Design a protein around this ligand. Structure first.
Ligand SMILES: N[C@@H](Cc1ccccc1)C(=O)O
Ligand SMILES: N[C@@H](Cc1ccccc1)C(=O)O
Ligand SMILES: N[C@@H](Cc1ccccc1)C(=O)O
Ligand SMILES: N[C@@H](Cc1ccccc1)C(=O)O
Ligand SMILES: [Zn+2]
Ligand SMILES: [Zn+2]
Ligand SMILES: [Zn+2]
Ligand SMILES: [Zn+2]
Ligand SMILES: [Zn+2]
Ligand SMILES: [Zn+2]
Ligand SMILES: [Zn+2]
Lengths: 399, 142, 399, 399
């Protein structure tokens, strides 16, 4: 039971910044909010709800040695790195994340929930579902010998080629403690494959995935660059679309009429655009796709925002360095999106994307996830780069 | 050889991947890798043809009837307890295959949706009926 | 470039407590000691070299649920616990440990060396070498189905039955990044096997293990309860003997003539004796062995010390809770061993056991592992339970 | 707390029949014997210690359908028969048995010890150790397809071909919960192999088996028909020899000097001789061996007894029907062995063969295994076929 006196409070529901306020917190919930036991004085700081990043990969981080780790490193090394990654993510002001791929994240979520390590609240997708040769196929680029001693990946490994295999893959993800489902509808940039945006799912397979996920209470996120795969994913009924690179007017209309959420991920596009100029950083098959696809996200996201498509906050950290997520906010404001909507997309719209109602706004009966900033972010957007106070579930982690 | 009652045996219970009767729930990655993904011979089905093969495999092993788990359960090492784990097509395939071999089908069900699917497919008995409601009651009576 | 000013200093080379001293720490080494840049002041505290624990298992900790973790838990789950275990071990005053079994410990050592997590300096053995049905056999207690699924373990898994297999197992431990070798010469208490002290190695096999390890520059530690297996291990040429449970005068003469080190591990025996009186804590096949064997270590260690057998500090944490290793000191003093020798066995004798010469004494040119206690340990031993200052390699971790 | 009053008592230590006696049974042991709480009255019956059968196979019983059960029956089907087999064996007067082969018998021993089923006290050997193509090879007679499916058996399956393999096989039998070791030194009758008495072990392999078993505290029993293999087994140091079919003067001298025990098994030879005259009962490869070898046991056992070879009681039930083991007594008497020695071989010599000292004679401080006969066995041996009172460990199972 504590009382946090905030000099200025940001309302995520209305998007407006209020004046001095007091928050009485008990049992990890916001017990009461008073306009105008232990006292926490942040009377010269701007208070906000904890941020949510809807696209992270806490089990990896890009480096020049990435494309060999799968042959040299064990999951235990990735877990030891993920401890520091999760600590840096929590200290940057993000009290919740959605992990969109990786088999160490559910274990890390269990460890954080038990109290062994510090970090955010993780909504884990587990292994991403793909087709043969797809963006998430775990055998792309392997020679004949390794592929022969591995075998052709199947539904247990996340690779499907029919409706029944898609059903089995969704059920296998449920068996392993996943919180949601992730599919790759088209090709990608960082995969060891020729194509970058070709459609890799049929409408029947995506419909089977969505129908199976509805039975287990799972939401489906879709990775899509090309227009045809994005259209198939939207018409099948996925909840969110990732990177939306080649989105057009018909896809925009379908998104608006369906209510699908859009996650642009400015940070990943800028990172892959900058890192493709360095010789030898990416493999020769990856570099042209990175150079071509990275420099379109800002334009596509600005066009989608101007047309009324619902946009939510997500960065794809795992390509960029963990702990620098808030820079995305800056990229959102220099692309023509107002700062208030940018903060709403990380606080109140992120909860709608996640399908929960116990977080997002500083209201009674909700989780006590509170952060504070030195400066007011509605005038200068760089103020989000200096987080002073972090509290999660009523426990103070930075003060 | 021994004393006891007259036994009508069902054998291994048919389930889906991660179901209440899945024999690999809660096993770590190593044991599950040396076991492999259970299939129709092990009682785990994910399609109509797999359900047909599972019913025929139970017949091959001298079963007297068929047992399926339509929803989740309590004592299983799985997260859910009543979520629907069978599609209507799979249960219909199970019942149609069992009718050919003279088998009756018993269904384990806690949640309402799985119970409704099992009843509308044509199972003989429903087990534990935990979240039964008025519509399921009417369907069972009819 | 720091200078630490201690009110009283302990000399591990001689076993006496000196007066005020100043130590100049630069580049991670002890540069120069002065009788009587930045200044650290511990003028009311007693300064000592950092302790070494020669028997730990940082990848496990005994609990009521232990004997099922082999079927329900993954290595990443163990690594997430090992992070906290290592943090507690380092914080308790132990800047160096010798891990005597486990496949996670080398990865934790690499992570600590890279700076990802905090912990002591680890000398890891990796997998322990045993025979078929031995104390360290990873398949003991499994049913026929699982045992057929995995197959009979061989030299790669650490199970040997001949001279060539022992050679290959030593080379396989070298291939996996081990710093030393560990064998189980007899049966044990916590294994799922019927015997507790029967001889499980032949002289030829142990000689082959020692001869192979000598080529690769390793030292061999042997776990031994029974007199025949321990005699075989001593006569083959192992470096240290663990738990010495049924040691007698012929064995004592052999160790005195051979120069073998002895590690009693009071804490493990006391812990198993206490836990054998709780119903259901241990399996039914384990409880009688624990009750019989636990209550003999104290007497055997005292009677070995009275005859002049060289004794080194070890606890077997992993059986007891990590971070409580200093309590072993108390068990050493109440058994008739002077506190000066108890501290020397953990500082200067531990370095001799490890085979290194860059640690153990606070002398110029050696690593700067310095701990400080509030009270004086040479009058009351319980003062070892309150560590106030911990420094390792020149970096302060507690002050 | 019971008192049993017997009209006449047999002294197994001396071989004489005493007069009336009273035995006080408390806590499962014989407490005190009186010449001349609850009272059990057997005043018109002869009291004896419970018998021991040193050669049984409680997991099988010979039948016309035997040589197909390896392909159509599961172990549970055998356990359900073993329940009744053990009940009949205990009810026939045998309170202790030594099982000389089978993977179900250790489980039956555990079940009887836990009290789930009724039966005698079992000393089980587990799998029998043989060489490639040996009498106990579990793959003899299979076609190429099945043999390729299972693969060539190794030490885990009980087949050895070298010293290290024999060591590993002994350790593997120890790992599976065996109480002793069993090897087949020569060929046999009931195996699906060409030979019946050829030497199938080398001296080095048997010496390795014996030396390994001595470390783990086991005794070794060797099945042997031919003189070369039996000589090798005797000179290596086995504890007992089974069936002794082609024993000669040199072998007899070797057993007399070494102190080896001899188990003739009259019943098995008589049964195979009787069943070799029925068409189709045995396979064509088995019938000539049975007809040749069965009709030599009686003569060999009698002529071995005349030379002073120590003889112990054994039948090989599993070949003949369980519960008819006492008939062997008759076969012993008509072959020239006195009834007193026949009873001593089953009571006091059996304990020496087993290596235990808590059974065999009705003396204070020993287990209370007491049987009673209606008639006097020292005048008519057929009285052993009518057992009226059976008690084991102080619990009355028949009265
Ligand atoms: N994960 C994305 C990275 C990316 C995002 C956005 C733009 C460009 C690249 C991919 O590999 O396809
Ligand atoms: N077998 C049932 C047990 C049960 C029956 C009825 C009610 C609750 C539990 C299950 O695990 O689901
Ligand atoms: N590792 C030892 C534990 C132990 C140490 C000392 C005494 C008793 C037990 C064992 O299981 O055998
Ligand atoms: N087990 C013996 C049976 C037997 C015993 C005695 C004489 C003849 C046969 C065998 O098959 O060889
Ligand atoms: Zn993506
Ligand atoms: Zn991604
Ligand atoms: Zn049920
Ligand atoms: Zn040990
Ligand atoms: Zn140990
Ligand atoms: Zn035999
Ligand atoms: Zn036999």
């Amino acid at each position: 039971p504590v009382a946090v006196q905030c000099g200025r409070l940001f309302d995520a529901r209305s998007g407006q910044l209020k004046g001095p306020h007091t928050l009485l917190v008990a049992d990890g919930r916001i017990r009461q909010v008073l306009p105008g036991a232990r006292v926490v004085d942040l009377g010269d700081k701007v208070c906000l709800p904890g941020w949510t990043d809807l696209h992270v990969h806490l089990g990896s981080q890009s480096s020049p040695q990435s494309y060999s780790e799968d042959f040299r490193l064990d999951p235990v090394d990735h877990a030891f790195r993920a401890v520091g990654y999760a600590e840096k993510t929590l200290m940057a002001g993000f009290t919740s994340v959605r992990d969109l791929g990786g088999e160490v994240s559910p274990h890390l979520r269990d460890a954080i929930n038990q109290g062994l390590v510090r970090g955010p609240r993780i909504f884990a997708a587990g292994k991403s579902i793909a087709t043969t040769g797809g963006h998430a196929d775990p055998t792309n680029g392997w020679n004949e010998r390794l592929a022969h001693l591995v075998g052709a990946p199947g539904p247990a490994e996340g690779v499907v080629n029919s409706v029944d295999e898609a059903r089995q893959a969704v059920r296998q993800r449920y068996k392993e403690g996943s919180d949601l489902i992730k599919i790759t509808a088209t090709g990608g940039v960082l995969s060891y494959a020729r194509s970058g945006d070709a459609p890799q799912f049929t409408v029947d397979e995506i419909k089977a995935v969505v129908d199976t996920a509805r039975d287990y209470g799972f939401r489906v996120a879709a990775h899509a660059h090309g227009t045809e795969g994005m259209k198939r994913a939207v018409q099948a009924g996925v909840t969110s679309i990732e990177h939306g690179t080649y989105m057009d007017d018909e896809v925009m209309r379908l998104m608006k009429q369906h209510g699908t959420w859009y996650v642009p991920t400015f940070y990943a596009g800028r990172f892959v655009t900058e890192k493709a100029a360095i010789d030898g950083y990416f493999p020769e098959v990856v570099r042209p796709k990175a150079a071509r696809i990275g420099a379109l996200i800002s334009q596509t996201a600005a066009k989608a925002y101007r047309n009324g498509v619902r946009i939510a906050f997500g960065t794809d950290q795992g390509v960029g360095p963990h702990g620098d997520n808030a820079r995305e906010f800056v990229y959102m404001v220099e692309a023509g999106i107002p700062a208030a909507y940018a903060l709403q997309a990380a606080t109140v719209h992120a909860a709608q994307v996640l399908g929960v109602d116990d977080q997002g706004v500083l209201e009674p009966g909700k989780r006590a996830d509170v952060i504070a900033l030195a400066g007011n972010p509605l005038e200068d957007i760089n103020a989000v780069l200096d987080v002073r106070f972090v509290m999660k579930d009523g426990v103070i982690y930075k003060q």
